[PDB]
Amino acid sequence: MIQRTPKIQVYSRHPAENGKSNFLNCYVSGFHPSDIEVDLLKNGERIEKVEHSDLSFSKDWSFYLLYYTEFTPTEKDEYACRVNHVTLSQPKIVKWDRDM
Amino acid sequence: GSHSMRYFFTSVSRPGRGEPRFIAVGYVDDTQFVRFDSDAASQRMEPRAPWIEQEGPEYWDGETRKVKAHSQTHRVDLGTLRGYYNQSEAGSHTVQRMYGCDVGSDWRFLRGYHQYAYDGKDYIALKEDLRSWTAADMAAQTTKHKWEAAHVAEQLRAYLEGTCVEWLRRYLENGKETLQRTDAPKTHMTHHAVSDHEATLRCWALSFYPAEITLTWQRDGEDQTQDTELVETRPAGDGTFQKWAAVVVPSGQEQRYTCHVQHEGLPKPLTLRWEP
Amino acid sequence: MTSAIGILPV
């Protein structure tokens, strides 16, 4: 069967302002099969209180999911998204970039 | 103008770990309104939008009943497909099903679909005429014959041209505030150094609905689609969407370049230009 | 709403 690897984007709901209220999104799309591990990280540790959309798929039959968590960004605190899939020999970490 | 309803169903087998996972979701245009998820506590079809929560208690019972049926059907399908492809018991496998319908500005039936996949690849689907199947291979030609004998095409054509459309038109009037109004992009443009003699210009579209949008870059009013970078359109998590388009350029040339947005909500197209 | 008809096993 066809294995297709995830495309990943980490970004916030609104434009970030330090010390102001926001959501942090990790969008994993374009992948197959469906069994995927997704974790948001703060200074490299699991944020427990994370939620996710209901699994769905695209015209090409590949899966997509939004994971999100309330946060308050700041200057020094470093947010990431870690992804494991059957197509990745090791988990893939993607840092949050305010300007992407 | 046009609108649509879509239901999406996924089952995954868990070969030494019991019952198949099953998830269904339905959307009107880009707004999700319901879900069912075998592995959650309630085992009911649940509301996922405010405008659908008003619906009577017999809405949920029937939708629940029906979806557990689709489920027991996908469950049988997993066993038959393993049989047809002679795959071992050991492996995890996947069926997906998609159906629904589109309408015009006049809200009249326009087209319908019904598509089925095994292990992420076309297995059988219903053609545009609504009367015939496109079968991907020999295993699936066996299914095509079973469905030609049970008149499945006619049975789905009657759901598609009838029940699907009527109930779409319904939801539109009940969730009109959220489903008929169309948020135009808040657009903005950024600039970053990437070295001594180069610079990135990123064109941003934020906070828009529906998802259909187009971002392009021009050098002196001439398209150039290579040396660009365009991300997949992504949901903001609050109904709206986001997208950006970038292009790497020579330092000092930033006003050669222009960003062009096209969206349903904008009347003229927009043009952007690095100034700040 | 989902369909009561034409959802048959393969």
Written account of the structure:
- The complex is a heterotrimer of chains A (100), B (276) and C (10).
- Chain A has a single domain (1-100), classed as Immunoglobulins (Immunoglobulin-like, Sandwich).
- With 100 residues, chain A is an all-beta fold.
- Helices cover 0% and strands 47% of the residues of chain A.
- Chain A has no helices and nine strands.
- In chain A, the strands form two sheets. In chain A, strands 1, 2, 5, 6 and 7 form a five-stranded antiparallel β-sheet that branches.
- Chain A is elongated, with a radius of gyration of 14 Å.
- By secondary structure, chain B is α+β, with helices and mostly antiparallel strands.
- Chain B has two domains: 1-181, MHC class I-like antigen recognition-like (Murine Class I Major Histocompatibility Complex, H2-DB, Chain A, domain 1, 2-Layer Sandwich); 182-270, Immunoglobulins (Immunoglobulin-like, Sandwich).
- Chain B contains four helices and 16 strands.
- Chain B has helices at 57-84, 138-149, 152-174, 176-179, and strands spanning 3-12, 21-28, 31-37, 46-47, 94-103, 109-118, 121-126, 133-135, 186-193, 198-208, 213-219, 228-230, 234-235, 241-250, 257-263, 270-272.
- An eight-stranded antiparallel β-sheet of chain B has the order 4-3-2-1-5-6-7-8, with helices on one face. In chain B, strands 9, 10, 12, 13 and 14 form a five-stranded antiparallel β-sheet that branches.
- The longest helix of chain B is centred in the first third of the chain and has 28 residues, at 57-84.
- The two termini of chain B are 36 Å apart.
- Chain C is elongated.
- Chain C has no helices and no strands.
- By secondary structure, chain C is mostly loops.
- Chain A binds chain B through residues 1-2, 4, 7, 9, 11, 13, 15, 23, 25, 27, 29-30, 32-35, 53-57, 61-63, 66, 68, 99-100, and chain B through 8, 10, 12, 23, 25, 27, 32, 35, 37, 48, 92-94, 96, 98, 117, 119-122, 190, 192, 202, 206, 231-232, 234-238, 242, 244.
- Chain B: Glycans are attached at residue 86.
- Chain B: One of its GO terms (cellular component) is Golgi medial cisterna.
